[PDB]
């Protein structure tokens, strides 16, 4: 299902579907336009974990756990330079919320099947 989330996030990058940034996360949670978001667990965050769990469990938002902060920015594309191979200078992001428009996809059926149950 990791390839399914990669395809969904890449298509959101193509059509500007994802609302990247904690600033735009606050905008989307204020306007209640949060289809999905990805949260990094067991990181070195000093006190941000409680606030971001409150944001991730505020109102009809799924709880998704990944491992590290800077690898999340590789999916969302903060420092996508030298795309032929591994990027060599990457800073990271905490969490990214999405606002999906083209929901009719191939693996989005099993994504929403796992989302409902």
């Amino acid at each position: 299902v990791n390839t399914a989330l990669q395809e969904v996030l890449k298509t959101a990058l193509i059509h500007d579907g994802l609302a990247r940034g904690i600033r735009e996360a606050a905008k989307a949670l204020d306007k209640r336009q949060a289809h999905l978001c990805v949260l990094a667990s067991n990181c070195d965050e000093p006190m941000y974990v409680k606030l971001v769990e409150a944001l991730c469990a505020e109102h009809q938002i799924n709880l998704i756990k990944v491992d590290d902060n800077k690898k999340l920015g590789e999916w969302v594309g903060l420092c996508k330079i030298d795309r032929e191979g591994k990027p060599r200078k990457v800073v990271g992001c905490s969490c990214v919320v999405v606002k999906d428009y083209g929901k009719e996809s191939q693996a989005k059926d099993v994504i929403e099947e796992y989302f409902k149950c």
């Binding site: 600033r23 606050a26 905008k27 989307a28 204020d30 006190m47 941000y48 606030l51 409150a54 505020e58």
Partner: protein, 68 residues
Amino acid sequence: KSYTTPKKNKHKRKKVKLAVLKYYKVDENGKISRLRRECPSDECGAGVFMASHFDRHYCGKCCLTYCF
């Protein structure tokens, strides 16, 4: 090049790390506590935050000076 007169500085955005927790007050129970106001007009929503002065207030883009 340069003259004898010194050059003028400009208001640059200084690098402050993790200011997002300055938006709301993180409490124990899951209810958001906010120390700031918003812009009540429909041109800018509540997602846009405001300018924290001490006696007067500023909207997002409306330039409406909210005073007491």
